[PDB]
Amino acid sequence: ELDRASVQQLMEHFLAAYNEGDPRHLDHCLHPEYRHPNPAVERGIEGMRAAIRRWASTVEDLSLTLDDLVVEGDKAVARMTFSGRQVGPILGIPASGRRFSVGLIDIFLIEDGLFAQHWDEMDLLGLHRQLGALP
Amino acid sequence: ELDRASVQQLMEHFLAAYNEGDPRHLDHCLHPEYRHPNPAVERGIEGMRAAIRRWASTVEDLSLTLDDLVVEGDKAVARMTFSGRQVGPILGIPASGRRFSVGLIDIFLIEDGLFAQHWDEMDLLGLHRQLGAL
Numbered sequence: 398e399l400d401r402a403s404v405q406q407l408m409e410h411f412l413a414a415y416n417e418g419d420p421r422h423l424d425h426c427l428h429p430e431y432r433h434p435n436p437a438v439e440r441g442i443e444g445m446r447a448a449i450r451r452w453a454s455t456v457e458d459l460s461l462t463l464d465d466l467v468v469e470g471d472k473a474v475a476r477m478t479f480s481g482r483q484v485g486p487i488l489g490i491p492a493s494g495r496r497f498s499v500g501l502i503d504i505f506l507i508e509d510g511l512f513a514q515h516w517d518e519m520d521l522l523g524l525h526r527q528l529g530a531l532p
Numbered sequence: 533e534l535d536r537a538s539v540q541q542l543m544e545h546f547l548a549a550y551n552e553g554d555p556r557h558l559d560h561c562l563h564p565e566y567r568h569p570n571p572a573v574e575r576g577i578e579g580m581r582a583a584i585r586r587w588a589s590t591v592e593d594l595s596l597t598l599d600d601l602v603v604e605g606d607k608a609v610a611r612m613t614f615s616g617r618q619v620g621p622i623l624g625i626p627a628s629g630r631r632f633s634v635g636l637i638d639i640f641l642i643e644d645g646l647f648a649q650h651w652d653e654m655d656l657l658g659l660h661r662q663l664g665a666l
Contacts, residue, residue, distance in 0.1 A: 464651075465607075465639065465651070467602055467603075467604045467607045467609050467639065468602075468604055469602045469603055469604050472600070472602045474602050474609045474637075474639070476639060476651060500651075500653055501653060502609075502637040502639065502651075502652075502653050504600060504602065504609070504611060504637065516599075516600070516611055516635075516637075517637075518635055518636060518637045518652075518653035518654060518655055519653060520653055520656075521655070521656075521657040521658075522656040522657040522660065525657065531666065
């Protein structure tokens, strides 16, 4: 339903939310009834707003960049690179003060012109290794 | 330039290579000059054939399933689940005899009607955890 240019605009807002640590960008790309796949995350867009706030506090010099975008029908696939310096706990890893850079791929479902749900993979093994949690 | 149904057919061959432990299926979906992103892997399709042979010998009941497929132009995105029981060395982990089931997402580049390159992420952390290595 969304044209490709429109999906590109959604992605610009998604990236800006993280890079600027400004959750308001999410209002322009995420569904208010967003369904995070982790049930520990709050239902709706508040769950993703909480993620923005967490990253803003635990990562310095955060950078999220778009390596590739693939769009078909109600699906958008974003391959991205996520980097920064760890200054707070990240996914069970105590604050190391170290740089990291890892890849991820998110697949978004589009509903009502917004991302409503995702499935993802991130190089968490690489993240653990870079942040000194694993040899 | 591949019709979408044609990409689905490529994926059926890709899945069958793993599920049947038969590298010949790769001849019907991978470019002979395949470019694996890992420089440690042999150049061309033999790098991927080697992967089939390895997984087929180290995993019992190997199952590779296609959970979602997104196709646009010369790109095919396959979200998959990789399951089985470890019966040989996997990534330096000695044979544990344990079950595993982990997700991956592969993005394939299509050249000359075949997959010629990929970018991917796979839940290797989860695989290590499930096999008792971490």
